[PDB]
Design a protein around this ligand. Structure first.
Ligand code: GIF
Length: 810
């Protein structure tokens, strides 16, 4: 009996759909979360900024009976995210409107419920007709989970606790909680708040009892403090979680309860020395993530994200930037449990709109790009705070970011620099910048004033995490009062400004908040103790931000991600793994000496194009080869991404010679090689400890190798199976040099989530059991249902057959 199951949905729109007497039984049944945009095909006539998928106007409905014991109680319906411009009705009557696609909210439906036993009905209209109102793919509908909460009239409201730990040592932590208590009875009520604390193994480690008297219709804040001895500290390598169980008592009887998971950890940003987690000075190995996972779209399916994060974590990542909007509660829960530090961003724009198709300031105006900027003046406060009410207990969250690249949207910011920029500092001095800024004409809104209001609102809700922002032009935001509102200046693609921040504003902590997946970005981080990390754009590829010149149909994604749309490890991931992890590691790629970005003359490698050198490489990694399957005798440049200080390369057993990481300024081991069928083997050492990796020439495609991440799942409507298809030759050696059209067949009760191959440059039907491979591989994503049973999975490509998999559903 989960409230998220058995919803009705339709991609239509009629005025009668909310009426007391309208029956939606003819509508399709769905389980939340749901994103309808991915059930529509990739169209050439949709907008590339939102991933070539239309929105439209859609509706949901949900019936539920009033409990037999709904007397002296309240009812709250809670949404964690609905995209967007959504309207809410219960039993014929309007509850309200909610513009923003990413903030959570709730309605008090207590007085609307029909008497004990009888049926109630919620209706949601979603207006995603403005299907280009975003620079990236959004999806459509109730894409995060919902809740139906019943409480006593004396109760902790929704999100009614805030747990903090202002003193943290290894002997003890001071753990404070604020329990709000609302009395919705018509007379005064006396009681007690009992809050019990519990560890990893459910042993009670603390307790506090406080008395209260609260007047009719008033809300009271009860603060309680305890000392937790020898705490298990939450860390990225040891994410231990505690539980606060706060109970409201009348007489001696529990009348309401809230459970507040939390962690005990200290965080500190030091402007001279860097970032400190529980007293360990560590670098932030961050990645940026949008909210979609391809076949599922915006629908928050946890197992799908678990796999992607596990991969990211195996690559060394310890932090996540939620670009450029509030994340899902369930995603933050995943981060608490798995161990990532999380920057949650409130907005992508404030007073003035960005161009949705092109980046930066809005140049054109049309109906379908009309976004949240229309509601920002009235809604920014309610939204920012609700996000924080919802999010603030999660130990993962270590930064609140009030805005991304805002400077583009205000007349005078870019002008007041000297630039009109990636690779230079500004030609104007700090005073000259300030003088230019004073010379610009007054707009209706100011970047500084709005920064202050947002920073101030933020601090009313939480002072235990720093305020930051991703500043694209720090030089001017240092002078407008914007950076002055922040505790941590975040720099979008400004490694060339780290020395400038230290020199000119040393007492303000600074950091990479958006960066390129390249060694030259990380070199700049580890050479500076005052720059504690970076956040790569992006950790995993995402739908949208295409359709521009150079990236026309049928391209869906940019390909800037470390992981592709299937969550498979790309070349850029293995470079970062070679920089972010310590256990010895070698990845072997190559290109034709023609296609390679490097060239050997006199036994020494340099960049081909000196106007495109290694220090200026941008978002998308070159299309390099993992195979060893060229034509005989062709000249090849083997490029290796490794943490080994010495590697020796063998071609069929003949030693090509040892090389040293010290000799390669761009952190890439290189060899010139004359291709002949066989194998390449790299043997390397990282301070004495050895490791070996190799690639093999294969014969033509023989079989389909199928792997499964789990051989058993539960019949809970939510567990995911990820099936990986990989082409192999007669001897089982992996193919990546030719593609095949693979048809999966599955027996037993399952729900298809879909198929992906990781090709950013080409569309495909998500809902087909057939998928073309990319780099010899593909992914099929299935989901458990109500029905237990066995699933028999196999595949073919005409002649080409496969091994057979069996997965139980318990
Ligand atoms: O792909 C380029 C990126 C630049 N910085 C902001 C991101 O949202 C994105 O537009």
């Amino acid at each position: 009996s989960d409230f998220n199951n058995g919803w009705k949905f339709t991609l239509s729109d009629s005025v009668c759909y909310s009426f007391v007497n309208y029956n939606p039984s003819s509508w399709k049944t769905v389980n939340l979360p749901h994103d309808w945009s991915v059930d529509l095909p990739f169209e050439s006539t949709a907008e590339g900024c939102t991933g070539f998928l239309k929105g439209g106007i859609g509706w949901y409905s949900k019936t539920f009976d009033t409990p037999d014991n709904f007397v002296d109680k309240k009812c709250y319906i809670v949404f964690d995210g609905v995209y967007n411009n959504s309207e809410y009705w219960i039993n014929g009557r309007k509850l309200g409107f909610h513009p923003y696609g990413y903030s959570p909210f709730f309605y008090d439906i207590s007085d609307y419920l029909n008497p004990k036993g009888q049926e109630n009905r919620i209706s949601v209209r979603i207006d995603h007709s403005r299907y280009a109102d975003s620079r990236w793919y959004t999806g459509s509908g109730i894409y995060r989970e919902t809740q139906l909460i019943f409480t006593d009239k004396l109760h902790i409201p929704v999100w009614g606790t805030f747990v903090t730990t202002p003193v943290v040592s290894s002997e003890r932590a001071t753990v404070n909680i604020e329990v709000r208590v609302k009395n919705d009875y018509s007379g005064p009520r006396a009681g007690e708040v009992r809050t019990s604390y519990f560890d990893s193994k459910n042993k009670k480690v603390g307790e506090k009892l406080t008395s209260f008297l609260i007047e009719a219709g008033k809300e009271m804040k009860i603060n309680q403090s305890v000392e937790i001895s020898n705490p298990s500290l939450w860390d990225v390598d040891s994410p231990s979680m505690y539980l606060a169980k706060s109970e409201i008592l009348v007489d001696g009887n529990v009348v309401d309860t809230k459970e507040t998971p939390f962690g005990i950890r200290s965080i500190k940003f030091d402007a001279k020395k860097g970032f400190f987690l529980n007293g360990k000075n560590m670098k932030i190995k961050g990645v940026c993530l949008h909210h979609d996972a391809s076949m599922i779209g915006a629908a928050l399916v946890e197992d799908v994200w678990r796999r992607r994060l596990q991969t990211l974590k195996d690559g060394g990542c310890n932090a996540i930037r939620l670009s450029h909007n509030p994340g899902a509660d369930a995603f933050l829960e995943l981060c608490d449990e798995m161990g990532f530090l999380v920057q949650e961003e409130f907005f992508d724009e404030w007073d003035y709109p960005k161009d949705k198709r092109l980046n930066m300031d809005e140049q054109s105006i049309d109906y379908i790009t009309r976004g949240y900027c229309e509601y920002f003046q009235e809604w920014a406060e309610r939204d920012l705070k609700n996000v924080m009410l919802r999010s603030r207990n999660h130990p993962c969250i270590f930064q609140w970011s009030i805005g991304n690249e805002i400077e583009w949207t205000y007349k005078g910011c870019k002008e007041s620099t000297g630039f009109f920029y990636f690779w230079n500092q500004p030609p104007y001095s700090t005073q000259r910048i300030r003088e230019e800024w004073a010379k610009q004409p007054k707009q209706t809104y100011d970047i500084g004033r709005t920064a202050k209001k947002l920073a101030a609102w933020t601090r009313e809700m939480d002072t235990t995490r720093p305020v930051t922002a991703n500043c694209i032009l720090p030089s001017i935001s240092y002078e407008t009062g914007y950076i002055d509102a922040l505790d941590v200046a975040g720099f979008s693609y400004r490694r060339v400004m780290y020395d400038y921040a230290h020199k000119n504003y040393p007492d303000k902590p600074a950091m990479g908040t958006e960066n390129l997946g390249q060694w030259h970005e990380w070199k700049a981080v580890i050479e500076r103790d005052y720059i504690p990390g970076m956040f790569i754009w992006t950790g995993v590829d995402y739908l949208g931000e295409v359709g521009t010149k150079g990236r026309e149909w049928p391209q869906r994604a940019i390909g800037c991600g470390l992981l592709d749309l299937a969550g498979f490890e790309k070349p850029s991931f293995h470079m970062m793994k070679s920089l972010w992890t310590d256990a010895p590691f070698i990845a072997i790629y190559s290109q034709t000496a023609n296609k390679s970005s490097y060239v050997e003359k006199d036994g020494k490698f340099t960049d081909k194009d000196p106007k495109k050198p290694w220090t200026q490489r941008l978002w998308v990694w070159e299309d390099v080869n993992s195979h060893w399957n060229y034509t005989k005798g062709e000249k090849v440049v083997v490029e290796i991404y490794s943490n080994c200080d010495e590697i020796e390369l063998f071609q069929n057993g003949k030693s090509l010679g040892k090389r040293f990481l010290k000799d390669f300024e761009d952190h890439i081991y290189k060899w010139s090689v004359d291709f002949k069928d066989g194998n390449i083997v790299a043997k390397g050492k990282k301070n004495g400890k050895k490791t070996t990796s190799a690639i093999y020439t294969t014969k033509e495609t023989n079989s389909i190798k199928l792997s499964v991440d789990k051989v058993a799942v539960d019949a809970n409507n939510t567990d995911v199976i990820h099936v990986t298809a990989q082409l192999i030759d007669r001897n089982g050696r992996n193919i990546s040099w030719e593609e095949k059209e693979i048809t999966f067949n599955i027996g037993g009760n399952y729900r298809l989530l879909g198929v992906e191959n990781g090709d950013h440059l080409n569309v495909l039907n998500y809902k087909s059991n057939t998928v073309k491979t990319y780099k010899g591989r593909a992914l099929l994503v299935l989901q458990a249902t109500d029905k237990a049973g066995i699933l028999n999975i196999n595949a073919n490509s005409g002649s080409i057959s496969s091994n057979d998999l069996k997965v139980e559903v318990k």
